[PDB]
Structure formats: C-alpha cells, structure tokens
Amino acid sequence: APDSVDYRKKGYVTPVKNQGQCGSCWAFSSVGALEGQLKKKTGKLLNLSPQNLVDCVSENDGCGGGYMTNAFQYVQKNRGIDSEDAYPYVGQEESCMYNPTGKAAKCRGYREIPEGNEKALKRAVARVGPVSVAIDASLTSFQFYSKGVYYDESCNSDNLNHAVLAVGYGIQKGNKHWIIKNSWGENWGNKGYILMARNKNNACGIANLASFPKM
C-alpha cells in the first residue's frame, strides 16, 4: 500500500453530484463505490443511478437516510443497477421503477472494513479503489469547509449521520488525510471535495462504517 493514492487521477471517479433536498447521501456513496469498481473491471467510467437505490432499497429509508451495505445487497439481489440516464435523479422518493434494459452494472456482494480501523481502511482503498464511508457531518465547521485538512474536536464518532466516498488518502502540510467526495455539488467545499483528518483517533467516525462492493 502506497503512502498516497488518488483514484481521481486513475479515472475511477465521476463528476461531483448534488443530492439536493433529500437524505440520499447513502445512495450517492454507494453508486460512487460501484462506479469505481465498474471502471476498474470494465474500463468504462459512467454515472450509475442513485434514484434507483432511493426508490428500490426496501431496507433503507429513501430521502430519510440509509446504509450503503443495504444498497450493495439490493444491487446484487436485483442483479443490476441502472445508469443515471436510465433512472434519473429527482431528489424525492417515488415508486420503484427499475428498468432492466438500462442496467449499467452488477454487484456480487460487499465487504466491510473492521470497525474503527483506519489502517485497514487505508489498505482497502489501496487494494480496491473508492470506498463508501459514514461520518458525522453535522458540524457547522463541516458545512463551511473550504480548504485544509478538516478536523474539529466536537466531531462525534458515534453520531454517523452522513455518507460519502473515500477516493484516496495522503498528507498535506504534515497532516494526514482522507480524500472525500461529497454529494453537495461542485460549489461546496473544495470543488465538491473535503480532506478529512486521517489517523487522528478515527475523526468524525470515518472508519466506523466503511464498505465496498464486489463485482
């Protein structure tokens, strides 16, 4: 495992999306992970459907939140997830309307990173690619992030309330970080991205609910 890795520079990461006024972070985290595996497997980079997940993952709560593991299971069981174009994002939950002709990827299971183990998350990112992670994104400091390696004393490892994508890791001006793709649009943070403190006692719970899909 290298000391720094950025899957964006390998072409594994799609443009930053905007979940709008719906608690579908978990769907965007899940599709980001699937996108990265799809590129690694097939050589194609393309947008998969978070709406497909929002409407059809019965184990999750749609715009009221959900888990990525339940998303990956849905895709496996369903034997497919649609492309964005085949099931576009509307930011509100509707009846499940999966379209077999628009299938753009499959899932053959998922694996979880041992809870709170940032070394294991690092190795997982280096060996697989982008990994779905859950964090405490509830602080005002998080909302108005612009630059630097995000750390706040008041972040809560036990309050996982937001889901994002770990697309890499490294170090900036002495400070180790995770490279995190968010889903609040390109005009949030640093072009839709945030660097979050790494190996600082599992800050914001970043390694407490990490998972990736198999393909």
Ligand X SMILES: CCCc1cc(-c2cc(C(=O)N(C)C)cc(C(F)(F)F)c2)nc(C=N)n1
Positions marked catalytic: 25, 162, 182
Cβ 2 to ligand X shortest distance, Å: 27
Nearer to ligand X, 39 or 181 (CB): 181
Cβ 67 to ligand X shortest distance, Å: 5
Nearer to ligand X, 24 or 52 (CB): 24
Residue 108, number of CB atoms within 10 A of its CB: 12
Nearer to ligand X, 93 or 175 (CB): 93
Interface residues toward ligand X, by CB under 6 A: 23-26, 61, 64-67, 134, 160-163, 209
Cβ 141 to ligand X shortest distance, Å: 18
